[PDB]
């Protein structure tokens, strides 16, 4: 779910960046550091809505850097276990289905996929279809999946999609 929260970050500013525009560099440096980095506690960070306040810059003894604590408001998305969220299928494979939800990517194991669904290797575009063809799931389609679990590693978060529950899959 998309959440707008205030985050605490520490910026170590090199002495070369001192002088005029010091705060501007701190603000600019904050965007580069935060953007493209994700943490399990708060999830992926998209962009910084605003900077609440720049704290006092404590000079590091001996190191020469100045540690600037920054309070900034940014919007983050985190996968919640037992939650249904719309997803877009990127690649289709017999082993499993890969789907992307914004920056977050979810992987669907074959076991979690409903039994009636079967891989369609014969078709040029890989897809899952039923015997009666009532429901067809292929690449680049909006589907609903349940987040069975979340694992975070190397500052990257990903979930497991299960279509066993009702009101799931392509609608």
């Amino acid at each position: 779910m998309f959440y707008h929260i205030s985050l605490e970050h520490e910026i170590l500013l090199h002495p070369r960046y001192f002088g005029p525009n010091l705060l501007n560099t701190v603000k600019q440096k904050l965007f580069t550091e935060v953007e493209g980095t994700c943490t399990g506690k708060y999830g992926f960070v998209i962009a910084v809505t605003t900077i609440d306040n720049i704290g006092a810059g404590v000079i590091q003894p001996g190191r020469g850097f100045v540690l600037y604590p920054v309070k900034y408001k940014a919007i983050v998305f985190r996968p919640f276990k037992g939650e249904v969220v719309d997803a877009v299928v990127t690649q289709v494979n017999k082993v499993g289905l890969f789907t992307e939800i914004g920056p977050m990517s979810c992987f669907i194991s074959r076991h979690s996929i409903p039994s009636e669904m079967e891989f369609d290797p014969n078709s040029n575009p890989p897809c899952y279809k039923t015997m009666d063809e009532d429901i067809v799931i292929q690449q680049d389609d909006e589907i609903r999946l349940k987040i069975v679990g979340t694992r975070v590693d190397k500052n990257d978060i990903f979930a497991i999609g299960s279509l066993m529950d009702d009101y799931l899959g392509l609608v």
Binding site: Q91, N93, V95, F107, D153, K154, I160
Partner: protein
């Protein structure tokens, strides 16, 4: 001393214990209280062997012991160990051995779930199903490990789990006859 308690004590001792324990219980069945020395002469067992058996019988509290100290005819102190069966304490301990085994079914089942479903045989390192996707290279089209540069197979991890399930239903058969035995405790 109702005969139900006497009958069961023989049944349980002959089931989970060797003939040595059963023979000792027979002496205590015939006589409510018997000296340790008297039992040794009757059974002709070794001193260490009898003590170990008695200690085991004391471990499960099937029979209790009391120490009597007196002066012998020649003046030397005599310390005789008198062993007697305590049915009231026996029933509680033997009953405890039921629920543990009955509840042991759940504990054993958890052991199988611990084993990982996905494993890498070439590198002999368990592979998490999720970590496989990150380790999996989309260009290659199949999951692989960079360090050993070889394909992975999770079929091997499947076989051990199936066997353990048979060990469970097979486990229950052991405690089925004993369930009938312990019904004599309540009667």
């Amino acid at each position: 001393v109702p005969a139900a308690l006497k009958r069961l004590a023989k049944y349980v001792i002959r089931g989970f214990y060797g003939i040595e324990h059963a023979l000792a219980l027979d002496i205590l069945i015939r006589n409510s209280c018997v000296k340790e020395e008297d039992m040794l002469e009757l059974l002709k067992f070794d001193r260490k062997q009898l003590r170990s058996v008695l200690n085991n019988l004391k471990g499960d509290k099937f029979i209790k012991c009391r120490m009597r100290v007196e002066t012998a005819a020649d003046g030397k102190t005599t310390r005789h160990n008198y062993y007697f069966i305590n049915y009231r304490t026996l029933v509680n301990v033997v009953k405890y051995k039921l629920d543990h085994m009955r509840r042991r079914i759940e504990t054993d089942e958890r052991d199988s779930t611990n084993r990982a479903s996905f494993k890498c045989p070439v590198c002999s390192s368990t592979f998490t199903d999720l970590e496989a996707n990150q380790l999996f290279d989309p260009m290659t089209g199949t999951f692989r490990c960079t360090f050993c540069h070889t394909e992975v197979e999770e079929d091997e991890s499947a076989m051990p789990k199936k066997d353990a399930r048979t060990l469970l239903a097979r486990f229950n058969e052991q405690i089925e006859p004993i369930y009938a035995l312990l019904r004599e405790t309540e009667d």
